């Protein structure tokens, strides 16, 4: 199995579409130096699933509220960009290798680390209680995360400040 063939499948495992198959993306031959680097790279694609399932399962039911939409519709502007990176990486496959990917995808291994762990801390929260559980992620100090989550808060807290400028009501 050539190294180029692995570079062909990995660019798909970054999305969910599976040599590399589906919780770790167990790869199934080739030398040990190749399987190890694929394993870590393939697993980044698995994260992308956990963040995609939420923005697809909750984009189905109509009883998630008005805040749960501006959150589920702010996890997409932070995904189109992840679809622009996959665009660029594919144009060069026609040269890049495994050890060259690690530096390319070292940063989106973190943004896909906060978002894939921001949708688990707020699972059953709807309404304002969700805008209060994506604010408990700002007390972090890490200048790269505190400047990412402090942007999703600026979108999730827009509907809340829409009622206010216009608290449980009773029908």
């Amino acid at each position: 199995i050539t190294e180029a063939a692995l570079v062909r499948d990995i660019l798909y495992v970054f999305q969910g579409i599976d040599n590399i198959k589906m919780n770790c993306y167990k790869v199934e031959n080739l030398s040990r130096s190749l399987r190890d680097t694929a394993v870590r790279l393939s697993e980044l694609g698995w994260l992308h699933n956990k963040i995609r399932r939420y923005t697809d399962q909750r984009s189905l039911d109509r009883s998630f509220g008005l805040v749960g939409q501006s959150f589920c519709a702010a996890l997409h502007q932070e995904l189109r960009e992840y679809y622009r990176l996959l665009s660029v990486l594919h144009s060069q496959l026609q040269s890049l290798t495994l050890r060259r990917l690690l530096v390319w995808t070292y940063d989106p291994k973190i943004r896909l680390k906060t978002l894939a762990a921001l949708v688990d801390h707020c699972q059953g929260r709807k309404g304002g209680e969700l805008a209060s559980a994506v604010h408990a992620y700002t007390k972090t100090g890490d200048p790269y995360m505190r400047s990412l989550v402090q942007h999703i808060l600026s979108l999730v807290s827009h509907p809340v400040l829409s009622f206010l400028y216009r608290v449980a009501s009773d029908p």
Partner: protein
Amino acid sequence: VLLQNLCCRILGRSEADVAQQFQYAVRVIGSNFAPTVERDEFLVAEKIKKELIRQRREADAALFSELHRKLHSQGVLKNKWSILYLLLSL
């Protein structure tokens, strides 16, 4: 003779006029002709993307990747490292 056209493009003059600068350009170019670092277009590419990303211009960092491939597609350029190493510096 080609270095003198450059001194006439940047400075707007004729070769009979500007000859002190062209005396300074032969001093620098000459004795510094041979390339001093190993040549690879890969490293110079990953530094023009890292630079356009640093200016919040993430859209042109993925457009360059499509313009750098076309250079290889046509194939009239022998030293692609040099001309990129220079365009990055300016």
